[PDB]
Amino acid sequence: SFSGYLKLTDNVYIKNADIVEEAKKVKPTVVVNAANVYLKHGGGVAGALNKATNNAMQVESDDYIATNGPLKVGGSCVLSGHNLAKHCLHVVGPNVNKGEDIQLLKSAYENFNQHEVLLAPLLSAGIFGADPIHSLRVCVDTVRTNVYLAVFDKNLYDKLVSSFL
Numbered sequence: 001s002f003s004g005y006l007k008l009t010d011n012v013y014i015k016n017a018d019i020v021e022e023a024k025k026v027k028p029t030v031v032v033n034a035a036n037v038y039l040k041h042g043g044g045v046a047g048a049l050n051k052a053t054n055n056a057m058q059v060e061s062d063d064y065i066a067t068n069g070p071l072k073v074g075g076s077c078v079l080s081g082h083n084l085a086k087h088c089l090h091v092v093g094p095n096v097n098k099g100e101d102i103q104l105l106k107s108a109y110e111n112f113n114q115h116e117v118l119l120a121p122l123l124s125a126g127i128f129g130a131d132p133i134h135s136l137r138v139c140v141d142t143v144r145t146n147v148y149l150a151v152f153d154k155n156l157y158d159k160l161v162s163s164f165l
């Protein structure tokens with residue numbers, strides 16, 4: 001199971017790790033993807049997770065969108081975890097770089113509550129443009145299930161831990 005995590009709260013844990021390497025090591029029940037509404041896994045966490053699946057995540061995602069249409073910002077869907085996890089919970093946080101409402105970040109984190117344990121990145125962080133310190137605060141104030149956060153950037157990981165209230 002999960003090793004080397006710093007415990008932030010009763011249910012939130014954090015580690016400086018590449019979520020792809022972490023998923024391959026742990027093979028958790030659920031890995032969270034930082035998805036967009038179209039499930040186009042081009043860059044950031046999504047591009048990295050999809051590349052680790054040899055594009056199988058994108059092929060599955062395109063079939064999901066062809067059948068169901070796009071997700072909502074703040075929404076999610078459960079798909080296969082491929083070689084990374086049992087399932088992948090694709091969660092759409094607001095993309096501040098697209099002018100999306102940062103208030104939807106709490107709705108995005110609420111999706112985590114449907115899973116007893118998850119390996120996840122900080123929603124709306126990275127190329128999504130939100131402040132990762134704010135994302136961590138919404139995470140700890142919204143998620144009640146056990147969430148193991150992987151923060152790729154060491155400098156950001158240190159800043160998140162050192163500034164955690």
Ligand SMILES: CNc1ncccn1
Nearest residue numbers: 018019048121150152
């Ligand atoms: C590419 N891996 C990654 N990216 C962001 C957060 C955690 N892991």
